[PDB]
Amino acid sequence: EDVEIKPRGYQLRLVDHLTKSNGIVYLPTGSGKTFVAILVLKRFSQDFDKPIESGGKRALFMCNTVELARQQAMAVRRCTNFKVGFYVGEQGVDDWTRGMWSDEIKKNQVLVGTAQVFLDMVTQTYVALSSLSVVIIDECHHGTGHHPFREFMRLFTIANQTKLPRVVGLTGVLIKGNEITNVATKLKELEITYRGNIITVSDTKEMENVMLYATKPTEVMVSFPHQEQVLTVTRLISAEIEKFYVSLDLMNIGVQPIRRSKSLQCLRDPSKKSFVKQLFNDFLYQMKEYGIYAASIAIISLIVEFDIKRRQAETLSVKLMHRTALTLCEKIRHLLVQKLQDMTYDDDDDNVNTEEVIMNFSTPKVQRFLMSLKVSFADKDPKDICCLVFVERRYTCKCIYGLLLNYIQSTPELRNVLTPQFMVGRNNISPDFESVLERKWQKSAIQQFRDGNANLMICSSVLEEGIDVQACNHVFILDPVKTFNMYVQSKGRARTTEAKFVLFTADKEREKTIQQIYQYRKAHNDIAEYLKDRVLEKTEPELYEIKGHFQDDIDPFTNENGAVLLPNNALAILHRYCQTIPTDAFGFVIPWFHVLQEDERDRIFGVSAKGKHVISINMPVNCMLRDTIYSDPMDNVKTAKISAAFKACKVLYSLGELNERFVPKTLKERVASIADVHFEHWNKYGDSVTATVNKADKSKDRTYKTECPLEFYDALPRVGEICYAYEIFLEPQFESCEYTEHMYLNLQTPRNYAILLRNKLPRLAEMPLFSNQGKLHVRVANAPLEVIIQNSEQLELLHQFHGMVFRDILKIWHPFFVLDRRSKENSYLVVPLILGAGEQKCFDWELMTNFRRLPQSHGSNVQQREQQPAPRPEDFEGKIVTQWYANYDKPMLVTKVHRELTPLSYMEKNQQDKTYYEFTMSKYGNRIGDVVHKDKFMIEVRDLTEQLTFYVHNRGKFNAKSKAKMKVILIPELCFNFNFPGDLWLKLIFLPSILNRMYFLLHAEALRKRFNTYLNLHLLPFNGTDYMPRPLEIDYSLKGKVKPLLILQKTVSKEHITPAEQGEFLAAITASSAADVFDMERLEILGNSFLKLSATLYLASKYSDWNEGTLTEVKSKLVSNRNLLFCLIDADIPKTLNTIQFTPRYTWLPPGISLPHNVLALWRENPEFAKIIGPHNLRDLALGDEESLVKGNCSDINYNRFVEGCRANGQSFYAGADFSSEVNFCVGLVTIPNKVIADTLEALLGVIVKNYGLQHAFKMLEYFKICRADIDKPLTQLLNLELGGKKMRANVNTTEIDGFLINHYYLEKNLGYTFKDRRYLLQALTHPSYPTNRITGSYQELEFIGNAILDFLISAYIFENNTKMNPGALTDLRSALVNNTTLACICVRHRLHFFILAENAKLSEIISKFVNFQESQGHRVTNMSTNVDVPKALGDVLEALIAAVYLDCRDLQRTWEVIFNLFEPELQEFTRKVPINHIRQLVEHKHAKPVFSSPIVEGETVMVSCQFTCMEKTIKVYGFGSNKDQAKLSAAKHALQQLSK
Amino acid sequence: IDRYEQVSKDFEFIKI
RNA sequence: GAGACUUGGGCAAUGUGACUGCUGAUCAGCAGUCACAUUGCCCAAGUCUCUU
RNA sequence: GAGACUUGGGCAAUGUGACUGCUGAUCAGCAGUCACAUUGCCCAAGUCUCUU
Ligand SMILES: Nc1ncnc2c1ncn2[C@@H]1O[C@H](COP(=O)(O)OP(=O)(O)O)[C@@H](O)[C@H]1O
Ligand SMILES: [Mg+2]
Ligand SMILES: [Mg+2]
Ligand SMILES: [Mg+2]
């Protein structure tokens, strides 16, 4: 700070003597004793930085008050180089640990704090006492009796009596109290307390120059008459006041705890009854003392404080009494002002009239005060005025201030110069008069006085000690001096020169006053006489003095680790420990004390304790010990009480309840009450409640295997069985045009290909199939045709036909495949059927007996064609051909026959005036010598498509394929012919797309049967059912009363349960990646919404003794995707999900064909070779035809090849390469991510809720062991699930309701739901700030469930009423409709803001300004001028109130009716353009990107500035608001308006 | 009593 | 009345602890959804090869 | 009917940004209710030694 810190003429020898032994300094205030304390710290600053465990030390600075603690903290920070710890209670100290304390000790070389904080620090032995080099004691004159200074000083004896810290005593006045006679008897008490000699400066005369900084002011006194005359109105009001006292004694407030006198004498009225008595007593005291005009302001103070107490009252009984008291104080004010106005008829000069009425109605004492002030100041300069005025009581200060403002305003000579102020002690009275409690004035009155803003200071005894103030020029002690120390220090507050000390005394009591002042003068002169007359000797060897001084009280207790309990500290710790018990409705959390009667003393301890009092301690009804403990015989009631408390503490600790710190023990966890019964199935998967994964996409993508459907396993027919054949119908939808002639006619042909099964198949609905010409509808025969394998060779021929079909006619084959007859996974056969006897179709054995080996296309020479017979025209009609001269082996379909055309053909568009013979000689004449059969026959042919996955909807477009296409004609003898009919070929192309829907349709049928069996639906429409065909999910982007909701209409009725269509389940199976016309994503949103509603309701019903915070933080993990994944894995469903895109050419394994069995064995049973063999090794297994179509396994050469494939992978750069991505389909494994699986879980939920209603859906949710059943009763409906308690219902009867519901029918006139129980309504309208929350609760638990209710109702309504909207807009629409702001607009439009009950400062006017904004804006939904804060409470009020409406009838239809009546305009305005978030809208711009600055705290508001390149200009705009999230929206609001250019 | 009794304006700040 | 001491109401000042309420900032979790940079699939317009 | 090829359009699987609806923890500021503890003070009553 400065180098002028050189010590005064005394402090050097002061600290020199302090070094030798303990000392106490007595120097007057303002003489820098804090500085000499810092000097002592400097002298004892040798061993500070070293740690205690290494022998280091620190220091301790003791304090008295938190304000003085801060003052000394600043004083030590300004001129020290060490580190100081500012330790104050009600924060940190009660929550710190030994590690934190030790670490602070390591850094802090010295500490400061109040006395009890250090007491708890040392007695609990955070650090050893010897760790402190010195102890600094302020206000050491308090170090007597049971004050904490003496208690701490007691610890020195019991501690290690070697290398003790030094103690220094500082006090402006050495003695506190009136036992000033024989002050030598008082000094030695404090001397032996610290066992150090008192020291005072010897050269007082020479250092009186420095003492001029604390100059003695002149002492004058003012004498006023004290005539006993009182007015009539005082007697008029006194009788009524005592009448009110009686009436209050007759009040009927609720029960109140035990309250009686200090020595446990007769009972005393409860605090809420006696506080008003005390207040009125003090008001009457002020009125009698200071005058009527004083009471004229005191009564306003009573009004303004009773209003606060009424506002802060919780029970309704208190409010009526406080309102009666307020009306009484209003009457008192009225009559006081009536007296004022009955006076003041003399003059019309309002200023002079006010001054003269103040002079008149003032009591003579206050009149003398006023005119003494007037003559002392006399319109001098404001800077010349700086003083303290001390009165006795706090309300005295307030009333004196209130009258002084009016007196000063009534005098122009003092108007511009006096600025009064007042402050008081701990009982913090409001510093305002005309306003309710809304003030926030951080700068306390001491700082205001230090700034010079105020010049005259009114204060109680709060300012007499400790607080450092400017050296004021005057001191006026309005109230009589009563104590020696206070007089000494008050005369010390006129610290400057030429100061004046004014005392106001009564005329008739002036003689005793001067006598008392003279006695005080003699005492103050005699205080130094003991030290001046003291015999020069040390203060050390008399340890017996200290021993006797501290052994008088009750002996303490100690144990291991040095923890010591102070017997004088037992009451606090007992009350704290007994306050941790779970209280009843009115259970008492305090011990009950009952002094034993006179002759019970011998009943327990004997006749030896007749005069020694004994008291029993009664534990609470929920204590660890329900018994009682009795006190030791002690000579007084208070010592008996403390002894009983100490013994109770000792027994409680010896029973192990209290820890070594003696602090009450705590609680560990609460959420784990349910985290064991709901999340127990994770452990078998390696997961737990507290385990989470956030790296490497672990627990996000998992490899799964698939199982064939239950109706395809072991389906391969054998000899001597009734085989079943289901034919396939392909119905053409596209019209018959020139382009669609073949695809129509040859697809309507009777010939079909069918499936032979050993099992049964259900009725599978028609599904669409999109091909190039258009869409095809496929249905399977309902009734199979029973056939029997009557020979092994017939089965062999059928199986060879199946294999060669898949090998050639579709080319869906791989070299390493083997014709399968052993494995039963998805194994079956496909066989054509033809008319053999009547309409029924038998086996077309002609085909299978011919096409064992498909006709191999080969070139024919002229000699061969010369020997080749002439083909008939019928030999090609409907057959399949291909050209052998060309390198192309592609099959070619015969379209039109030529019986009327010759090879020297006619003209064409391209080869005009040319024949086909000339064209073929010109083009391919190289490999044709001549056409030997050059007559009477060519063929008109058309090629056929190669695409197989006929799933995409738009691939079959024809708008641009409508253009002209060439007509192609070929010569027969140059094109090789197949006897196969293209009729069957065209249908056989579509096969894999049929099979990969049959697969998942059978899976969906199995799941449908399971979920109709578990929910016991086996009714009529579920056995003789007919399944509606496949629907199209158009929204997959691939091209007044209410209408009752269809989602819930199937809950109270059974006729409306629509049968669960198999198409819905198939949609629930197929993921997005499969890319079919239908998907699960639309049902996803509804399923998730129902899951949320059900989980919230279930948790809020089972745990009605929990808060919504724990409910949310548990239902988070219950509904989390991690939970759904493991749940559905437990359900073992993933074997029946459709994800992959159906790549048939590479991954779709043929049904009756698989790679060799030995390969399966030694590659699937071996973990070491699990995924080491890559597809490059697999493709090299080009086995023999007999090695792959009959034998069924690999040869030795192929054996070595595929056993060395993995080794070659391990000796090349292929080592470590992934061989699982779409190259592990051989074993049937599939890799699926978690999102898909969870989405299918609640997609099944959505299907079930849509078709079967809410009730059946919630019943099914039980099956997934997520909603655990209750032991008392397994589970009930989603409705009538009885929930409620002390947080969902008001805890008051019907009589108290109207006192909290001023208006109810006016809310009814708009809501429309007559409540049969208003408790829900009251609990919904009760804000947390409202005082009843401590006993009744808040609307939080209700908003939590109303949120889910409104969410699900809105989600269901938008789902059902809009059939072709993707979730991209569905969630946007519901979020816009559940956004908080539009909820506030709904609240204000329907005028629910009137009834909402809350009490907070900013909330008082935020609602009013928002409703004014809406009314001016015409109820315009923002979904905005001057960034007005939205009152987020109103939306939460609706959220809780919807739930309150629901619970009153437990029906959802009524809630939906009310919600629709509420939202009718909104659901017709939002559906048009679905307004989105404005920040989102701004970020949606292509190039006008935003960038937002940092938060700015430049004032009470916050703001952020943004930049956007509008018209490629680097513009900058800014927005203001209360919070960052408010300005950011408004900043965007301005910016988007700027884009209006 | 109808009204208080007024006090004399002049006095002395007598030393104590 | 002095001294010793007690009781009851009252005054001023000091401090601990419990409880909930409001606001602002920071950190992280849950469910739904959207915009910008990577592969695959299907089209618009146009060029070449191949097929009459 | 296919391939090659360009420009553009549309849809689905990775990395950033941001919105909605529940919330939690920490820090800070402000405010309420209640209990208890210590020093000193006057007022009224009472007991004893004691002066009268
Ligand atoms: N030797 C000194 N060096 C520097 N400042 C001093 C010295 N002596 C007194 N002061 C100043 O005088 C003021 C005295 O006030 P205070 O410290 O409250 O007195 P005390 O400590 O005696 O109560 C302090 O603000 C202090 O800064
Ligand atoms: Mg000071
Ligand atoms: Mg999902
Ligand atoms: Mg809310």
Q: Helix/strand/coil (H, E, C) string of A412-460?
A: HHHHCCCCEEEECCCCCCCCCCCCCCCCCCCCCHHHHHHCCCCCEEEEC
Atom number of ligand 1 nearest to Cα A27: 22
Q: What is the full DSSP assignment across A1212-1240? A: STTTT----TTT-TTTTEEEEEHHHHHHH
Quote the Cα angle for A1197-A1199-A1204, to 5°: 100
Nearest CB to B11 within list A222, A360, A503: A222
Which token pair is A1081?
């994503």
Q: Spell out which residues of A between 743 and 802 contact strand D, using CB within 7 Å.
A: 772
| Ligand in closest contact with the CA of A1381 | 4
Residue A950 CA and nucleotide D4 C1' are separated, in Å, by: 24
Query: Do A98 and A165 belong to one domain?
Result: yes
Binding site annotation covers A580?
A: no
Quote the Cα angle for A1059-A1062-A1068, to 5°: 110
Identity of residue A924: Y
- Own/partner long-range contacts of A850-855 (Cβ < 8 Å, ≥24 apart): A850/A979, A851/A801, A851/A804, A851/A805, A851/A980, A852/A797, A852/A800, A852/A801, A852/A804, A853/A804, A854/A804, A854/A808, A854/A809, A854/A978, A854/A980, A855/A976, A855/A977, A855/A978, A855/A979, A855/A980
The CATH number for A641's domain is: 3.30.160.380
Query: What whole-number distance in Å separates Cα of residue A1410 and Cα of residue A675?
Result: 43
Q: Which residues have a Cβ under 8 Å from the Cβ of A693 and sit 6 or more positions away?
A: A699, A700
Our CA-based measurement puts residue B7 at a distance from the nearest CA of chain A, in whole angstroms, of: 6
β-sheet bridge partners, residue A1517: A1506
* Percent of residues in chain A assigned helix, strand, coil, to nearest 5: 45, 10, 45
Convert A320-386 into a string of H (helix), E (strand) and C (coil).
HHHHHHHHHHHHHHHHHHHHHHHCCCCCCCHHHHHHHHHHHHECHHHHHHHHHHHHHHCCCCHHHCC
Instruction: Name the DSSP letter for residue A609.
Output: G
Phi-psi region of A569 (alpha: psi -120 to 50; beta: other; left: phi over 0): alpha
Nearest CB to B7 within list A221, A225, A361: A225
Cα A631 off chain centre by:
50
Query: Do A515 and A565 belong to one domain?
Result: no
- A506 close to A365: Cβ distance less than 8 angstroms: yes
Q: Spell out which residues of A between 632 and 671 contact strand D, using CB within 7 Å.
A: 638
Read off φ and ψ for residue A971, nearest 5 degrees: -85, 135
Question: Cβ of A367 and B7 within 8 Å?
Answer: yes
- A629 close to A616: Cβ distance less than 8 angstroms: yes
Q: Are strands A58-62 and A110-113 parallel, antiparallel or unpaired?
A: parallel
Question: Cβ of A221 and B13 within 8 Å?
Answer: yes
Query: What whole-number distance in Å separates Cα of residue A826 and Cα of residue A19?
Result: 99
Q: Which residues have a Cβ under 8 Å from the Cβ of A654 and sit 6 or more positions away?
A: none
Residue A1231 CA and nucleotide C27 C1' are separated, in Å, by: 36
Q: What is residue A207's three-state secondary structure?
A: coil
Produce one character per residue of A517-526: b if its CB has 16 or more CB atoms within 10 Å, e if not.
Answer: beebeebbee
Quote the Cα angle for A1136-A1140-A1144, to 5°: 110
Mutate to test the interface with A, among B11, B14, B16 (most CBs of A within 10 A): B16
Q: Is there an atom of ligand 1 within 6 Å of A5 CB? A: yes
Query: Do A574 and A507 belong to one domain?
Result: no
Quote the Cα angle for A1062-A1063-A1066, to 5°: 90
Chain A hits for B7, CB-CB cut-off 8 Å, are: 224-225, 364, 367-368
Block residue for tokens 């209290």 = A658
What is the layout of strands, in order, in the sheet containing A752-757? A785-788, A722-726, A752-757, A829-835, A841-843
β-sheet bridge partners, residue A730: A778
Q: What is the full DSSP assignment across A866-931? A: HHSPPPPGGGTTTEEEEESSSS----EEEEEE-SS--SS----SSSTT--HHHHHHHHHGGG-S--
- A1534 close to A1505: Cβ distance less than 8 angstroms: no
What is the CB-side half-sphere exposure of residue A999 using CA atoms within 13 A? 26
Q: What is residue A169's three-state secondary structure?
A: strand
Nearest CA to A422 out of A353, A478, A361, A354 is that of: A478
Near ion ligand 4, which residues have CB within 5 Å?
Answer: A 1436
Task: Calculate Rg over the CA atoms of chain B.
Answer: 12
Q: What is residue A1400's three-state secondary structure?
A: coil
For A828, counting Cβ atoms within 10 Å of its Cβ (0-12 exposed, 13-18 middle, 19+ buried), the class is buried
Read off φ and ψ for residue A713, nearest 5 degrees: -75, 135
The CATH number for A932's domain is: 2.170.260.10
Block residue for tokens 């048939």 = A1144
Q: Which nucleotide is nearest to A1366 (CA to C1')?
A: C33
- A1376 close to A1423: Cβ distance less than 8 angstroms: yes
Query: What whole-number distance in Å separates Cα of residue A498 and Cα of residue A1349?
Result: 78
Query: What whole-number distance in Å separates Cα of residue A279 and Cα of residue A286?
Result: 11
Nearest CA to A569 out of A553, A548, A551, A588 is that of: A553
Query: Do A878 and A970 belong to one domain?
Result: yes
Identity of residue A449: F
Residue A611 CA and nucleotide D48 C1' are separated, in Å, by: 14
Query: What whole-number distance in Å separates Cα of residue A122 and Cα of residue A164?
Result: 14
Q: What is the full DSSP assignment across A492-546? A: TT--STT-EEEEEEESTTHHHHHHHHHHHHHHHHHHHHHHHS--S--S-S-HHHH
Identity of residue A251: M
Query: What whole-number distance in Å separates Cα of residue A881 and Cα of residue A939?
Result: 10
From the CA of A1378, how far away is ligand 4's center (Å)?
10
Query: Do A488 and A608 belong to one domain?
Result: no
What count of other Cβ atoms lies within 10 Å of the Cβ of residue A1017? Answer: 17
- A573 close to A662: Cβ distance less than 8 angstroms: yes
- The torsion of the CA quartet A542, A543, A549, A553, rounded to 10 degrees, works out to -160
Quote the Cα angle for A853-A854-A855, to 5°: 115
Q: Is the CB of A1437 under 7 A from strand C?
A: no
- A1326 close to A1289: Cβ distance less than 8 angstroms: no
Cα A180 off chain centre by:
63
First to last CA, chain B: 34
- A617 close to A593: Cβ distance less than 8 angstroms: yes
Nearest CA to A1475 out of A1422, A1428, A1516, A1513 is that of: A1422
Question: Cβ of A222 and B13 within 8 Å?
Answer: yes
β-sheet bridge partners, residue A85: A111
Cα dihedral A1371, A1376, A1377, A1379 sign: positive
Query: What whole-number distance in Å separates Cα of residue A1289 and Cα of residue A1323?
Result: 6
Q: What is residue A1325's three-state secondary structure?
A: coil
Interface contact B8, partner A, CB < 8 A: no
Nearest CA to A1414 out of A1389, A1379, A1383 is that of: A1389
Q: What is residue A468's three-state secondary structure?
A: coil
Query: Do A364 and A409 belong to one domain?
Result: yes
Query: What whole-number distance in Å separates Cα of residue A1478 and Cα of residue A1495?
Result: 19
Q: Are strands A132-138 and A166-170 parallel, antiparallel or unpaired?
A: parallel
- A728 close to A752: Cβ distance less than 8 angstroms: yes
Residue A1067 CA and nucleotide C39 C1' are separated, in Å, by: 26
Residue A154: which domain range?
10-219
Which token pair is A1047?
């989602």
Chain B hits for A225, CB-CB cut-off 8 Å, are: 5, 7
Mutate to test the interface with A, among B2, B3, B7 (most CBs of A within 10 A): B7
Query: Do A456 and A591 belong to one domain?
Result: no
Interface contact A345, partner B, CB < 8 A: no
Query: What whole-number distance in Å separates Cα of residue A392 and Cα of residue A460?
Result: 5
Chain B hits for A223, CB-CB cut-off 8 Å, are: 11, 14
First to last CA, chain A: 60
Question: Cβ of A231 and B11 within 8 Å?
Answer: no
Interface contact B10, partner A, CB < 8 A: no
Residue A307 CA and nucleotide C21 C1' are separated, in Å, by: 19
The CATH number for A402's domain is: 3.40.50.300
- A1017 close to A1252: Cβ distance less than 8 angstroms: yes
Nearest CB to B13 within list A220, A362, A514: A220
Convert A1448-1509 into a string of H (helix), E (strand) and C (coil).
CCCCHHHHHHHHHHHHHHHHHHHHHHCCCCHHHHHHCCCCCCCEECCCECCCCCEEEEEEEE
Which token pair is A554?
């009750």
Chain A hits for B11, CB-CB cut-off 8 Å, are: 222-223, 368
Identity of residue A1155: L
Query: What whole-number distance in Å separates Cα of residue A299 and Cα of residue A292?
Result: 10
Question: Cβ of B7 and A218 within 8 Å?
Answer: no
Q: Is the CB of A1403 under 7 A from strand D?
A: no
From the CA of A467, how far away is ligand 2's center (Å)?
6
Which token pair is A762?
């259900």
Query: Do A626 and A528 belong to one domain?
Result: no
- A844 close to A832: Cβ distance less than 8 angstroms: yes
What is the CB-side half-sphere exposure of residue A1107 using CA atoms within 13 A? 7
Give Dmax (Cα) for chain A.
163
Residue A579 CA and nucleotide D35 C1' are separated, in Å, by: 9
Interface contact A220, partner B, CB < 8 A: yes
Query: What whole-number distance in Å separates Cα of residue A427 and Cα of residue A445?
Result: 15
What count of other Cβ atoms lies within 10 Å of the Cβ of residue A675? Answer: 16
Strand D nucleotides where any atom sits below 7 Å of a protein CB: 1-2, 10-15, 17-25, 28-42
Measured in residues, chain B has a length of 16
Q: What is the full DSSP assignment across A383-413? A: GG--EEEE-S-HHHHHHHHHHHHHHHHT-HH
From the CA of A76, how far away is ligand 1's center (Å)?
12
Our CA-based measurement puts residue B8 at a distance from the nearest CA of chain A, in whole angstroms, of: 9
Question: Cβ of B7 and A514 within 8 Å?
Answer: no
Query: What whole-number distance in Å separates Cα of residue A1001 and Cα of residue A1346?
Result: 40
Name the helix (H) or strand (E) containing A1117: helix A1108-1119
Binding site annotation covers A1409?
A: no
Name the helix (H) or strand (E) containing A1438: helix A1432-1447
Identity of residue A502: V
Which token pair is A1460?
């629709």
What count of other Cβ atoms lies within 10 Å of the Cβ of residue A669? Answer: 7
Query: Do A524 and A649 belong to one domain?
Result: no
Convert A1154-1202 into a string of H (helix), E (strand) and C (coil).
ECCHHHHHHHHCCHHHCCCCCHHHHCCCCCCHHHHHCCCCCCHHHHHHH
From the CA of A35, how far away is ligand 2's center (Å)?
10
Nearest CA to A135 out of A12, A24, A215, A292 is that of: A24
Q: What is residue A728's three-state secondary structure?
A: strand
Query: Do A392 and A524 belong to one domain?
Result: yes
Query: Do A30 and A70 belong to one domain?
Result: yes
Interface contact A236, partner B, CB < 8 A: no
Read off φ and ψ for residue A890, nearest 5 degrees: -65, 135
Q: Is there an atom of ligand 1 within 6 Å of A30 CB? A: yes
Nearest CA to A339 out of B2, B11, B7, B14 is that of: B2
Identity of residue A521: R
Query: What whole-number distance in Å separates Cα of residue A627 and Cα of residue A648?
Result: 11
β-sheet bridge partners, residue A777: A731, A768
Residue A1171 CA and nucleotide D15 C1' are separated, in Å, by: 29
Which token pair is A1443?
């739930």
Alpha carbon separation from B3 to A349, A506, A695, A1269, B7 (Å, rounded): 21, 20, 89, 83, 13
Query: Do A471 and A584 belong to one domain?
Result: no
What is the layout of strands, in order, in the sheet containing A728-732? A728-732, A775-780, A767-770
Q: Are strands A1502-1510 and A1491-1492 parallel, antiparallel or unpaired?
A: antiparallel
Q: Which residues have a Cβ under 8 Å from the Cβ of A38 and sit 6 or more positions away?
A: A75, A76, A79, A80
CB pairs under 8 A between A and B: 51
- A248 close to A317: Cβ distance less than 8 angstroms: no
Q: Is the CB of A425 under 7 A from strand D?
A: no
Chain A hits for B16, CB-CB cut-off 8 Å, are: 219-221, 503, 514, 517
Give, using CA atoms, the residue closest to atom 5 of ligand 1.
Answer: A5
